């Protein structure tokens, strides 16, 4: 039922998507000239679209200048019957070269119809066949709040040769939610961002299998989700353990000169320092002009957070938290 972290390849699925996106090219390029009058077959297909690499879907905000008038000239059966004839007469030749199941799969998807059989359901390799069991048992026992048993499943799941980054870091709440003889959870997140923190440019030209960016890769212009989770989890733990200078020096070491979220937590690391240093327990020389740095850091790092892209902070309340730290100072 759940997703499996397997780079599973089979020839019959390598055919039927090469069979599909080939036909998609011709029926589009047919529409690319009938709309005018009025080389792997997949990579050439993905040279039209931009892969999102921050999200699953490339969302575009609508209250903007992406506005467009409606094409009211609709598509009827008279136009649709002729725009698919010359592709299908040009598609009829490799349909005999594929298998009988692929030839019936393509005729099914030519008119709608969605496959009712999953590409993972007949792997039958006895190793992958146990991964499919051990992942569906993994998410099920995480769901049942059964942590001492789900720890045993994930310990045996990461040792089978072929498992991936998918199941690895996502369900590593099993260390943090355990708290019996835990590894504190945060040390596993440090493990992830040591060996998977890449600085490669996201190449976007190769067809991707078995890695999909928005939760497991870490390229430039996308700080990885386990990287920013390592930031927030080591800040909440940093507050619950009252070391703040370790993280504030640790976040100091990468300038991520692209995003805004690591600037806000680098702002928020000083704001937690300005909270704790401004107690002063009097009932007075260096403790005043120490805090006035941290007040200044927050007003700049939040300002440079706004300089970057979309990360809508409450930039009004956070100013009103620093003013209350100066009323403690006066």
């Amino acid at each position: 039922m759940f997703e499996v972290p397997i780079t599973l390849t089979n020839r019959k699925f390598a055919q039927r998507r090469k069979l599909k996106y080939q036909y998609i090219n011709y029926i589009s390029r047919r529409f690319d000239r009938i709309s005018k009058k009025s080389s792997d077959e997949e990579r050439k297909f993905w040279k039209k679209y931009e892969k999102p690499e921050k999200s699953f879907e490339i969302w575009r905000t609508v209250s903007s200048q992406n506005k467009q008038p409606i094409n009211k000239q609709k598509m009827t059966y008279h136009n649709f019957k002729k725009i698919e004839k010359i592709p299908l007469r040009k598609m009829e030749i490799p349909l005999l070269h594929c298998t009988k199941e692929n030839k019936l799969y393509f005729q099914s998807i030519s008119r709608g119809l969605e496959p009712l059989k999953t590409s993972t359901s007949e792997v039958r390799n006895y190793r992958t066949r146990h991964i499919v069991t051990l992942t569906d048992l993994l998410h099920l026992n995480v769901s049942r709040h059964n942590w001492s048993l789900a720890y045993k499943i994930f310990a045996t799941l990461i040792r089978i040769p072929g498992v991936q980054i998918k199941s690895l870091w996502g369900i590593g709440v099993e260390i943090l939610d355990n708290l019996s003889n835990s590894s504190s959870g945060l040390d596993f997140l440090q493990w992830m961002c040591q060996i998977y923190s890449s600085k490669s440019r996201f190449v976007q030209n190769i067809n991707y299998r078995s890695i999909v960016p928005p939760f497991q890769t870490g390229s430039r212009t996308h700080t990885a989700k386990f990287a920013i989770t390592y930031l927030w989890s080591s800040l909440i733990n940093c507050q619950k353990s009252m070391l703040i200078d370790k993280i504030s020096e640790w976040v100091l070491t990468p300038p991520f000169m692209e995003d805004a979220e690591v600037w806000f937590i680098y702002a928020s690391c000083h704001l937690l320092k300005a909270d704790t240093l401004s107690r002063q327990f009097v009932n007075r020389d260096i403790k005043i002009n120490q805090v006035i740095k941290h007040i200044h850091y927050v007003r700049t790092f939040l300002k440079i957070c706004l300089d970057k892209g979309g990360f809508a902070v409450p930039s009004r309340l956070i100013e009103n938290q620093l003013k209350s730290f100066e009323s403690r100072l006066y």
């Binding site: 040591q194 060996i195 923190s197 430039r220 300038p255 000169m257 692209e258």
Partner: protein, 171 residues
């Protein structure tokens, strides 16, 4: 796995002690209608020890021993190919103050130059300097001298004094 390289490794290896230089550009075509921002690796420049960028910055005499250094490690030098060079301090002219030197090497320059002159050394806020010498001719004529590329140019002074702001000849 990325790790921190300490300068004791670069002494054993007989290599440099280089920190990575990152340099983000701007590709504004047509007055900034299409901006392209790319952080680019520009090689590793070598890094002075016990600076901001060395890994021995805020570090105890105990911890310098645990990282294979002298307990009172001084810093201030660069490790380049194991050889341990440093930048020599120089004496230069005081900044931003017009000195009033007389020099026989000024009459060597052109005809009717006296030995007199006012030499100023102006430095920018990025510590880059510029010298502007102000020569006295034997005609009542005063010239402004500067070296731009490696050449040396000689414009008259009331050309500049009328170019800086809107002036009368009584101001």
């Amino acid at each position: 796995v990325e790790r921190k390289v300490y300068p004791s490794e670069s002494r054993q290896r007989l290599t440099s002690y280089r920190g990575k230089l990152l340099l983000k550009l701007k590709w504004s075509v047509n007055n900034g209608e299409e901006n392209l921002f790319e952080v680019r690796d520009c090689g590793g420049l070598p890094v002075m020890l016990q600076s901001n960028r060395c890994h021995l910055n805020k570090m105890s005499p105990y911890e310098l021993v645990q990282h294979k250094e002298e307990s009172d490690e001084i810093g201030g030098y660069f490790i380049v190919n194991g050889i341990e060079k440093l930048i020599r301090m120089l004496i230069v002219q005081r900044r931003n103050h017009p000195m009033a030197i007389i020099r026989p090497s000024f009459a060597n320059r052109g005809a009717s130059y006296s030995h007199y002159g006012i030499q100023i050394r102006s430095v920018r806020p990025d510590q880059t300097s510029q010298t502007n010498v102000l020569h006295y001719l034997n005609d009542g004529q005063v010239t402004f001298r500067f070296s731009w590329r490696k050449n040396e140019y000689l414009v008259p002074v009331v050309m500049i004094l009328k170019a800086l702001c809107h002036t009368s000849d009584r101001e």
